[PDB]
Design a protein around this nucleic acid. Structure first.
Ligand SMILES: [Mg+2]
Ligand SMILES: [Mg+2]
Ligand SMILES: [Mg+2]
Ligand SMILES: [Mg+2]
Ligand SMILES: [Mg+2]
Ligand SMILES: [Mg+2]
Lengths: 274, 64, 113, 113, 348, 93
RNA sequence: GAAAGAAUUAAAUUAAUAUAAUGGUAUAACUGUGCGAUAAUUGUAACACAAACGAGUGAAACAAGUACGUAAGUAUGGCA
RNA sequence: AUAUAUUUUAGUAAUAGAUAAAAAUAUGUACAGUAAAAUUGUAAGGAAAACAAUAAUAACUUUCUC
């Protein structure tokens, strides 16, 4: 290496050169994953999604009707404030961080026909803490997740180190899986109908639960997972079983809207709302 | 002594040889470099013998 | 070599793994490939149309609501105020269930509470 | 007692060649720790981020709109040129070779492959 | 059923192969694909199930859409809009897709891929944008053929060159290739494929091959050299190969002088530029233009100035680049050019 | 100390050749508490399941609409409300 | 009016850089990935910086060979 | 349905993505991307394990549509 000086040279044309296309290296990779010729092809729209159809038909219109506030304008979030130029030291100064927060917050828009809240993604985080001792427990947890979802899990590793809890850094410990589209919908439907009613003293999801912006969550114990039909059908094959966190991500501007949406899909809500 | 010196002798039998340093129990170090006697890139190999930290040969054929 | 627990873990791992479980690649003839493309494109177009229809309908509903609320504001202020309230904790009723594949034995309940 | 009586010498890391100064190929225009100045037109950069002249010319310090928040040192091939050169104009190039008028020399050069 | 009709619609929109067409449109998956030539391979092959009925439904759907588009298309008066409507109507036609994808675009046979047809032309443009155009742009930028000769390019026509007359071999030159002096001894052949809607009868073109890298020792820099200059060339979407057949001796503003790089002068870029003429209104037929042949010089040639003078717009480009070899002296001798200079190996 | 499965050399999936994990799934009919059937794709091999405890018989999901068993069996002749009224004097507590 | 793309703007170098501290680094010098494992190669090195000498530093170019890259090119160990 | 012979499968093992701040090849080259903190939550989980979410779309291109 003669130098480390990185410096992209300017060009003399407005044509956008896709460099990937000019090579002959990865001919299978030039095709989109949606295209049949790609090895990455998967039949996406295999059957009619039921929960999605219901949302489209009944709920979406109802949600819109609920969320109509008359002549509602945009509520701007907390942003980085600029300095008043009352001193020459303000001249190339970085902007003041937001008022309360360190990070900037998004603008809350009025709900119209375009931006009605709806389900975006489900994530099922299972971090088994006994797997600090036994790596095989992580594998079993991942399998369980796969069984539940019908989707490929991704392994969670210990990102941090700590002595009090017997936890190393870079150790496989449980798994996660982001469900999207039809599989996610199915999983939600199963949760509503099969699993959550079989939980004994189940009041619902807390109203104090959630993000500030359109994200709601809750968790299932190891006792609760044995109600899933894939696990239930072979209790001999599943001696151990692991709890899980369930992060539901909506297209909701605020959290009460997201809660309302989830209620539309038969999720009970019990606590005192914020 | 943690890092020892070794003599890499050219495989094209010119007599040309290049010297490099390695860790005491490092794998056998063969490298392809220019031999100026032959005027081409040739293999170099260790002239002397020495003991090596024996790694288990990772099996791609799924055993047992 | 391995314990029974270790074996069972390996089996479980295999269930998830793509090792020696997946078929050959789906190769097509050029005519077949074209037919497939035409199927997919048409479908995509249909889906787009459906989305527009639904979206249009929603827009129309929104416009109607706007028209209503302005009228209400003009006429009866109290009624308008009542209409335009914060519906923060509004919950869909638990009877409005997600429509199943096939219907139940008792289709409709005529009595309640 | 114990005293902190130890320090390295100064690394002579100023600009070694100035604006408007004649340069030759190879000559160091800047010594630095990291790119305080970036290598501009007709100018190279070394392992120690040392800007050096690739051609004979006139050392010029400048800003380029393409790279805002970056100072440049380049070498204009004459004193006439504003060295943040116009983008869409053709590049001022130096041929930098001489024809072998001598017959023998030319013949030797032809022979050499 | 608009796509089965060929009263007003061109013949090129159909598949010319009968067997293929039959395979496409059957009532059951009984027949076997014409693409698979071998019997054993056909036997082995199994198409995906249920594909026929769904395909038929898709065809009907898109055929209906095309028919609806056509209802608008005929009412439209302005030409570009009409063309766009036509494209919309026929782009999803399976037959036209088959035709375009699986037959050559470079040397298109008119019955299969007709570039007179708007849809096919659009397809060809899209194909060009996908790869060949990008590549050309890269070669222009990297080699520095744009700012050094002619500020920018907005690629509209696909330009491909060939050197058929010198050696004998058939090869379209990839942009930024190193060609031997034997290869580029005699003149090249252009193919200017135009994808925009343009007046075929009126629109003329000019073609200029320029060598920016010939050394000028007075200036201690380089100068340009117009190696080959044609003007007032007539193109047609299908009939577009610029050959000594087409252009006359009147069209040649500067007849082909070959690349003869000097020893150690370096690599010399030869970047062909294709311009379209300015089109004048209220004048039927092709509007010619006169070039002052004493004014423009070959040993030094301001391309940009020339363009400004005659009001040209560069639509296409291509580039090769030659350097010294043993046969350049022979080429010079053949052409009657002088012995050729020899420079010092060091750029001192 | 840490129980593990020690990794073999990983198999190189080439770029472009990576294939999506399409797991083997059966279409499974779930009959809920009431006779409402619903089809769902499932990895376990069972074409039909009928459920006992669901949302369709839970009071939380529809507000508007075996020790005990053993005890009932072996105290059946007595028939064990009237019995509650008889044996519930609320003075002593 | 909607969906998708291309992205742009703002912010950021507070993380990260094998290692001190300083300067530099998102156009990334940081991180991931394919190939590779070659340039952690061979002879001449001008000219500069620094500099009492001895040494030290950056390095165009010429020639032999190699690796990656469609190409342009890049690599004579490591952001310094 | 069952017997013999000849084969075939089962060695069941993770990456399925040009992967992108868990850990691992620290020098080349090619392609691509962006970190951190803090905050709001969520089964055991607690100040401290993991996962999720947290700035702005004017203009442009394509697609569907009133
Ligand atoms: Mg000092
Ligand atoms: Mg620093
Ligand atoms: Mg001095
Ligand atoms: Mg000295
Ligand atoms: Mg480093
Ligand atoms: Mg490095």
């Amino acid at each position: 290496p003669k130098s480390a000086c990185s410096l992209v040279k300017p060009v003399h044309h407005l044509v956008k050169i896709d460099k990937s296309k000019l090579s002959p290296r990865f001919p299978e990779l030039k095709y989109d994953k949606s295209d049949i010729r790609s090895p990455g092809f998967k039949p996406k729209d295999t059957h009619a999604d039921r929960l999605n159809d219901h949302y489209l038909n009944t709920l979406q219109s109802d949600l819109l009707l609920i969320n109509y506030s008359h002549n509602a304008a945009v509520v701007k979030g907390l942003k980085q404030r600029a300095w008043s130029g009352d001193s020459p030291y303000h001249l190339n100064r970085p902007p003041k961080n937001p008022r309360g927060s360190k990070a900037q917050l998004p603008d809350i828009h009025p709900i119209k026909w375009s931006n009605i809240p709806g389900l975006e993604s489900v994530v099922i985080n299972c971090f088994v803490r006994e797997a600090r001792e036994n790596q095989l427990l992580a594998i079993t947890a991942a399998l369980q997740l796969q069984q539940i979802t019908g989707c490929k899990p991704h392994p969670i590793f210990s990102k941090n180190d700590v002595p009090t809890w017997k936890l190393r850094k870079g150790h496989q410990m449980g798994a996660k899986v982001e469900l999207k589209g039809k599989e996610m919908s199915q999983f939600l439907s199963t949760l509503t109908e099969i699993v959550l009613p079989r939980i004994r003293e189940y009041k619902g999801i807390s109203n104090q639960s959630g993000n500030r912006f359109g994200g709601i969550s809750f968790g299932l114990t190891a006792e609760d997972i044995k109600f899933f039909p894939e696990i239930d059908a072979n209790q001999d094959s599943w001696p151990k079983t692991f709890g899980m966190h369930i992060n539901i991500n909506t297209s909701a501007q605020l959290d009460y809207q997201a809660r309302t949406l989830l209620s539309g899909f038969q999720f009970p809500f019990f606590g005192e709302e914020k | 002594s943690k890092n020892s010196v070794i003599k890499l002798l050219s495989t094209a039998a010119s007599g040309y040889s290049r010297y490099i340093s390695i860790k005491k129990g490092a794998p056998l170090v063969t490298q392809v470099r220019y031999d100026p006697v032959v005027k081409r890139h040739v293999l170099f190999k260790e002239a002397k013998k020495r003991k090596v930290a024996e790694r288990k040969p990772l099996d791609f054929l799924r055993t047992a | 070599s391995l314990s029974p627990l270790a074996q069972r873990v390996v089996t479980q791992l295999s269930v998830m793994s793509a090792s020696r479980k997946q078929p050959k690649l789906l190769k097509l003839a050029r005519e077949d490939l074209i037919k497939h493309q035409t199927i997919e494109k048409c479908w995509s177009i249909y889906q787009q149309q459906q989305r527009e229809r639904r979206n249009l309908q929603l827009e129309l509903q929104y416009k109607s609501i706007e028209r209503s609320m302005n009228l209400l504001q003009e006429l009866s202020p109290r009624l308008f105020e009542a209409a335009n309230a914060s519906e923060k904790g509004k919950r869909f009723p638990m009877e409005m269930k997600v429509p199943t594949d096939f219907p139940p034995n008792t289709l409709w309940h005529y009595n309640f509470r | 007692s114990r005293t902190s009586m130890k320090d390295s010498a100064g690394r002579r890391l100023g600009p070694k060649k100035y604006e408007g100064q004649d340069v030759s190929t190879g000559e160091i225009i800047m010594r630095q720790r990291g790119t305080k100045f970036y290598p501009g037109e007709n100018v190279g950069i070394g392992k120690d981020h040392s800007i050096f002249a690739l051609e004979p010319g006139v050392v010029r310090y400048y800003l380029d709109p393409f790279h805002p928040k970056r100072k440049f040192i380049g070498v204009a091939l004459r004193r006439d040129l504003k060295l943040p050169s116009p983008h869409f104009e053709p590049t001022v190039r130096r041929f930098g070779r001489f024809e072998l008028t001598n017959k023998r020399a030319a013949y030797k050069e032809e022979n050499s492959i | 059923h608009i796509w089965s009709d060929f009263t007003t619609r061109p013949s090129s929109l159909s598949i010319q192969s009968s067997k293929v067409k039959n395979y496409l449109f059957q009532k059951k998956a009984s027949l076997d694909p014409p693409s698979i030539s071998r019997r054993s391979n056909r036997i082995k092959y199994s198409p995906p199930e249920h594909i026929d009925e769904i395909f038929r439904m898709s065809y009907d759907f898109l055929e209906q859409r095309s028919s609806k588009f056509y209802e608008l298309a005929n009412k439209t008066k302005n030409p570009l809009k009409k063309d766009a409507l036509l494209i919309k109507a026929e782009i999803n036609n399976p037959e036209v897709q088959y035709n375009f994808q699986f037959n050559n675009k470079l040397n298109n046979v008119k019955d299969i891929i007709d570039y007179d047809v708007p849809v096919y032309r659009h397809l060809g443009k899209q194909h060009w944008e996908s790869y060949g155009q990008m590549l050309l742009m890269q070669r222009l930028e990297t080699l520095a053929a744009i700012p050094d000769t002619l500020p920018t390019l907005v690629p509209r026509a696909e330009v491909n060159i060939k050197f058929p007359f010198s050696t004998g071999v058939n090869k379209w030159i990839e942009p930024g290739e190193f060609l031997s002096s034997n290869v580029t001894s005699m003149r090249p052949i252009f193919k200017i494929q135009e994808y925009e809607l343009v007046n075929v009868e009126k629109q003329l073109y000019t073609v200029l091959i320029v060598n920016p890298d010939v050394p000028d020792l007075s200036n201690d820099s380089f100068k340009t050299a117009l190696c080959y200059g044609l003007v007032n060339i007539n193109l047609t979407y299908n009939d577009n190969l610029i050959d000594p057949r087409k252009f006359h001796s009147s069209n040649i503003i500067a007849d082909y002088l070959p690349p003869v790089p000097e020893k150690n002068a370096g690599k010399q870029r030869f970047v062909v530029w294709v311009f379209r003429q300015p089109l004048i209104e209220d004048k039927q037929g092709p509007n010619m233009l006169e070039i002052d042949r004493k004014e423009l010089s070959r040993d030094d040639f301001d391309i940009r100035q020339f363009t400004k003078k005659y009001n040209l717009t560069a639509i296409g480009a291509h580039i090769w680049r030659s350097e010294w070899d043993a046969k350049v002296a022979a080429v010079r001798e053949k052409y009657g050019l002088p012995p050729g200079r020899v420079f010092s190996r060091v750029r001192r | 100390t840490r129980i593990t499965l020690p990794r073999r050399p990983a198999k190189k999936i080439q770029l472009g050749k990576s294939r999506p994990a399409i797991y083997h799934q059966f279409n499974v009919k779930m009959e809920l508490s009431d006779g409402s059937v619903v089809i769902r794709r499932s990895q376990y091999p069972k074409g039909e399941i009928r459920l006992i405890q669901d949302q369709r018989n839970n009071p939380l999901w529809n507000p508007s609409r075996g020790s005990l068993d053993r005890f009932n069996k072996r105290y059946s002749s007595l028939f064990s409300t009237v019995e509650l009224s008889e044996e519930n004097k609320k003075k002593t507590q």
